[PDB]
Amino acid sequence: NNWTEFVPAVKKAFGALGKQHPKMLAAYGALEEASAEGALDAKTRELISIAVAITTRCDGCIGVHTEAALKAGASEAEIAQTLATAISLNAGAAYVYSLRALEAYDQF
Amino acid sequence: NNWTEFVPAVKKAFGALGKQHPKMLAAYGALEEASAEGALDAKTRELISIAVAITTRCDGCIGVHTEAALKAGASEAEIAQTLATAISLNAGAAYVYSLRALEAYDQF
Amino acid sequence: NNWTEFVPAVKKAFGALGKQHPKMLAAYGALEEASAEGALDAKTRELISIAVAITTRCDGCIGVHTEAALKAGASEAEIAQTLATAISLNAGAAYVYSLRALEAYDQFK
Amino acid sequence: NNWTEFVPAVKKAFGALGKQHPKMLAAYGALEEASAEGALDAKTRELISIAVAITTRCDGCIGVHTEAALKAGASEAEIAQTLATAISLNAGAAYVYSLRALEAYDQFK
Amino acid sequence: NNWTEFVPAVKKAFGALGKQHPKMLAAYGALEEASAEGALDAKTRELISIAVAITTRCDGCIGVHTEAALKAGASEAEIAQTLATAISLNAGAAYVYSLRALEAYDQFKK
Amino acid sequence: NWTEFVPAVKKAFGALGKQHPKMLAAYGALEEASAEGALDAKTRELISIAVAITTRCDGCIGVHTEAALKAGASEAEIAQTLATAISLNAGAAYVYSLRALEAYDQFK
């Protein structure tokens, strides 16, 4: 459809990248191996990925790790709660720098 | 203090670039010239400048345009409301891309 | 394109989020309430909103608050000058960290 | 340098915000309420919080939720593996947009 | 993006801005003026421009400046290696702030 | 940046490879793929600084500004790289501002 058609195309672009520049795809594979090492469970790692995917505003990253979260057995409330946490942290960053603006106003 | 001393150091740094690379300082001066052309008052522009500064996480921009907003007659309630609006728009972005993840999960 | 149909689609997506997860939509309602608290008129609130939206590069946020600023009485010149102000700040941030890099090129050597 | 002094200072600034502007701190609490709803333990939520905090590069968000992760029982390897997952996704966004640049160069634009 | 049609659409919109608000387009020209001044050739400048465009995630910026890299004589290997360097620095920024998180956890640990 | 800040950053990277070696090996793979090709060390470090300005990473700035110096980068090459990165940073805001004015015209 929209995401069910986008994700295979994104995975294909990564495959064409490895056939042309294998050291670049091997660099990402090294990043995924470092992430996979440790007792974290695949679903929790994918949920961590979705929270970062929506923060970086990467549509290809969203669909890849959302489909991987479902394959890992993540329910709908687990994802919505993960997104709600990422929204709170994205808003928390603006709260911190807004706090710096208020502190500057009182100081001048 | 901090902000009352950090802001002069920032403006002193921008003055240094004008001596070493005047073309780059003039380019910024061209950006503020276009930003000042219109019927929007100084307080309105400086409030907009603060909301973008906390979004860009630019501490120098925060202090420079917070002091400038005070010089334009901005009250503390106006800056806090400006920051509240900027905080809201930063979270709505995480909301928008969170909805994309939910639609992605619903389609797989 | 098609901002006239994109904006109602974004609002509908927010509506389905509330009927499936009400505490997330209520949180955005609490954020929108604190943004309305104050003496800044609706036009200045939406102009500020558009400036953050183009800095964020959120398309749904841009169209929602551009239509709202229009209904609040914002002329095209007020919209353009708001973008010119947001673009200027979207360069001073790079200027500030460029000044750090030029200092970084000093000290060394 | 001193996160044990930075984090309490950030917490004090948030508390002073609610005394001068309560609706702003209330909207923050509403975001925390929706975050703590859905049977995801605090350890998993704080680990997710760190992964987003380093993506936003907010030092206040990092130290606040790193301490909260320790209080929830997060091990050092649990955070390191979380950061390793967050780093992989930060590069993943760069890979996806670099693929757009290569597809652009092929079409000769 | 990638399309040979989207890039002329971006350039046309920039010209429309200069017709309605010339002081805004002139400000961008002032920025491009300072970018063109210097010892770097056009290829290296457009390669640097591509690296920022994928970091700033601006599709039109990836557009305008990847074509200018082609016209400047940049090969596919020069485009790709620039992107591999840009990708490395993007992950590097996450590595740096991840170190702060590991340092903060060590100071709170008991 | 400083002559003492960069050694502290590289010391933390080395320590990370001692407690979590797969994470440091992943960054090395990203550096090996970046070094592979005809682009000289100067252009790569200049590209690295321009990204280290778009991203607001100070450690990346000082590390790669020093590496650019050892690679033989001149002051004119450093400033022009920044002016190029500043132009692109403003260029991104110009594009999404064009969609904002395009949306405003559609709602009338």
Question: Alpha-carbon distance C53 to C60, whole Å?
Answer: 9
CA distance D24 to chain B (A): 7
Tell me the Ramachandran region of residue C26: left when phi exceeds 0, alpha when psi lies from -120 to 50, beta otherwise.
alpha
Considering only CA atoms, which of C79, C80, C64, C69 is closest in space to residue C40? C69
Considering only CA atoms, which of B77, C18, D81, B100 is closest in space to residue A54? B100
Q: Classify domain A2-107 by CATH number.
A: 1.20.1290.10
Are A31 and E91 inside 8 Å of each other by CB?
Answer: yes
Considering only CA atoms, which of B20, E96, E49, A27 is closest in space to residue F46? E49
- Kindly list the distances between the CA atom of residue A95 and the CA atoms of B89, C79, D15, F103, in Å, as whole numbers in the listed order: 12, 26, 12, 29
Q: What angle do CA D78, A54, D50 make, to 5 degrees?
A: 25
Question: Alpha-carbon distance A84 to B40, whole Å?
Answer: 36
Question: Alpha-carbon distance D21 to C109, whole Å?
Answer: 49
- Kindly list the distances between the CA atom of residue E66 and the CA atoms of B4, E32, E34, E69, E95, in Å, as whole numbers in the listed order: 43, 16, 20, 5, 28
Helix or strand or coil: residue A57? Answer: coil
Question: Alpha-carbon distance E56 to B35, whole Å?
Answer: 22
Contacts of A4 (CB under 8 A, 6+ apart): B107, B108
Q: Per CB distance under 8 Å, which residues of F are interface residues toward D?
A: 19-20, 22-23, 26, 30, 55-57
CA distance F21 to chain B (A): 32
Q: Are B63 and B10 in contact (CB under 8 A)?
A: yes
Two tokens, residue A77 = 């409330």
For residue B103, give the amino acid letter: E
Two tokens, residue B31 = 């950006």
Q: Are A52 and D47 in contact (CB under 8 A)?
A: no
Backbone angles phi, psi at C45, to 5 degrees: -70, -40
- Residue the block writes with tokens 């191996």: A33
Q: How would you class B9 by CB atoms within 10 Å of its CB: exposed for 0-12, middle for 13-18, buried for 19 or more?
A: exposed
Q: Per CB distance under 8 Å, which residues of F are interface residues toward A?
A: 20, 22-23, 25-26, 29-30, 32-33, 36
Neighbours of E3 (CB within 10 A): 14
DSSP letter string, D3-69: HHHHHHHHHHHHHHHHHH-HHHHHHHHHHHHHHT-SS--HHHHHHHHHHHHHHHT-HHHHHHHHHHH
Residues in A closer than 8 angstroms to D55, CB to CB, are: 52, 55-56
From the list E57, E84, E91, which residue is nearest A24 (CB)?
E84
Q: Are A66 and A82 in contact (CB under 8 A)?
A: no
Question: Alpha-carbon distance C9 to A21, whole Å?
Answer: 40
Q: Are A86 and B78 in contact (CB under 8 A)?
A: no
- Residue the block writes with tokens 């202090």: B63
Residues in F closer than 8 angstroms to C86, CB to CB, are: 93, 97
Contacts of E43 (CB under 8 A, 6+ apart): E69, E72, E73, E74, E78
Q: How would you class F81 by CB atoms within 10 Å of its CB: exposed for 0-12, middle for 13-18, buried for 19 or more?
A: buried
Q: Are E1 and E58 in contact (CB under 8 A)?
A: no
Q: How many CA atoms lie within 13 A of F10 on its CB side?
A: 12
Question: Alpha-carbon distance A83 to D38, whole Å?
Answer: 11
Q: At what angle do helices D22-35 and B76-107 cross, to 10 degrees?
A: 20
Question: Alpha-carbon distance B61 to B24, whole Å?
Answer: 17
Q: Are B97 and D55 in contact (CB under 8 A)?
A: no
Helix or strand or coil: residue E21? Answer: coil
| Greatest C-alpha distance within chain C | 62
Question: Alpha-carbon distance A75 to A72, whole Å?
Answer: 9
CATH architecture designation of domain C3-105: Up-down Bundle (1.20)
Fold of F4-107: AhpD-like (1.20.1290)
Are A99 and D65 inside 8 Å of each other by CB?
Answer: no
- Kindly list the distances between the CA atom of residue F84 and the CA atoms of B83, C95, E75, in Å, as whole numbers in the listed order: 31, 11, 20
Question: Alpha-carbon distance D91 to F26, whole Å?
Answer: 11
Considering only CA atoms, which of E100, C50, E75, A82 is closest in space to residue B52? C50
Alpha-carbon dihedral of residues D107, D108, E5, E6, nearest 10 degrees?
A: 90
DSSP state of A18: H
- Kindly list the distances between the CA atom of residue C99 and the CA atoms of C90, E16, E95, F45, in Å, as whole numbers in the listed order: 15, 33, 23, 17
Residues in A closer than 8 angstroms to E54, CB to CB, are: none
- Angstrom resolution of this structure: 2.5
Q: Are D94 and E86 in contact (CB under 8 A)?
A: yes
DSSP state of B21: -
Chain breaks in chain E (C to N over 2.5 A) after: none
Question: Alpha-carbon distance A60 to A77, whole Å?
Answer: 22
Q: Are F51 and E54 in contact (CB under 8 A)?
A: no
- Kindly list the distances between the CA atom of residue F60 and the CA atoms of D9, E55, E72, E98, F66, in Å, as whole numbers in the listed order: 27, 14, 28, 13, 10
Nearest chain B residue to C97 by CA distance is: B58
Q: Classify domain E5-108 by CATH number.
A: 1.20.1290.10
Residues in A closer than 8 angstroms to B67, CB to CB, are: 104, 108
Question: Alpha-carbon distance A29 to A13, whole Å?
Answer: 15
Question: Alpha-carbon distance D97 to D99, whole Å?
Answer: 5
Tell me the Ramachandran region of residue C37: left when phi exceeds 0, alpha when psi lies from -120 to 50, beta otherwise.
beta
Mutate to test the interface with C, among D24, D25, D40 (most CBs of C within 10 A): D24
Size of interface B-C (CB pairs under 8 A): 168
Neighbours of F92 (CB within 10 A): 26
- Kindly list the distances between the CA atom of residue B67 and the CA atoms of A104, B42, C61, D13, in Å, as whole numbers in the listed order: 8, 12, 28, 20
Q: What angle do CA E17, E20, E25 make, to 5 degrees?
A: 40
Question: Alpha-carbon distance A98 to A96, whole Å?
Answer: 5
Backbone angles phi, psi at E84, to 5 degrees: -65, -35
The H or E element spanning position A20 is helix A3-20
Question: Alpha-carbon distance B86 to A94, whole Å?
Answer: 8
Question: Alpha-carbon distance C89 to C52, whole Å?
Answer: 11
Q: What angle do CA E69, E71, E73 make, to 5 degrees?
A: 75
Positive/negative CA dihedral, D27, D28, D29, D30: positive
Q: Are C49 and B102 in contact (CB under 8 A)?
A: no
Question: Alpha-carbon distance E106 to E87, whole Å?
Answer: 29
Residues in A closer than 8 angstroms to E57, CB to CB, are: 57
Positive/negative CA dihedral, E57, E58, E60, E63: negative
Two tokens, residue F5 = 């800040």
Domain D3-107, CATH among 3.40.50.360, 1.20.1050.10, 1.20.1290.10, 3.30.70.790: 1.20.1290.10
Question: Alpha-carbon distance A27 to D95, whole Å?
Answer: 10
CB burial readout F35-63, b (16+ within 10 A) else e = eebebeebbbbbbbbbbbbbbbbbbbbbb
